[PDB]
């Protein structure tokens, strides 16, 4: 009986936690991906001149 009334909050804070985690990891992946672009692109663009 007693343990029941608080389960609402477990569930609420789990949303909040899950949303924070996912938003953050999302930005991380967004940035890391955008970082990968120029890094690999510049490597190839430079390596082309090494081949030339």
């Amino acid at each position: 009986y007693l343990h029941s009334l608080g389960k609402a909050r477990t569930a609420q804070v789990q949303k909040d936690a899950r949303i924070g985690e996912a938003e953050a990891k999302r930005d991380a992946g967004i940035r890391e991906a955008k970082a990968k672009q120029e890094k690999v692109s510049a490597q190839y663009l430079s390596e082309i001149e090494m081949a030339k």
């Binding site: 992946g29 967004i30 991906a33 955008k34 990968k36 672009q37 690999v40 692109s41 190839y44 663009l45 390596e47 082309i48 081949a51 030339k52």
Partner: protein, 51 residues
């Protein structure tokens, strides 16, 4: 994942330009490599004529 696939496309377009140019340059190198190797026979056979 949406940004991931778009990042992968730009990496591929970069790859594309490089491999394409490698091939162009290798053709030139390969061409003149054969000549460098076989020139000894082109001259050797020509000299056996006088010999």
């Amino acid at each position: 994942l949406d940004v991931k696939f778009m990042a992968d496309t730009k990496i591929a377009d970069s790859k594309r330009a490089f491999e394409l140019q490698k091939s162009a340059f290798s053709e030139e190198v390969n061409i003149k490599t054969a000549e460098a190797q076989l020139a000894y026979e082109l001259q050797g056979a020509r000299e056996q004529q006088k010999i």
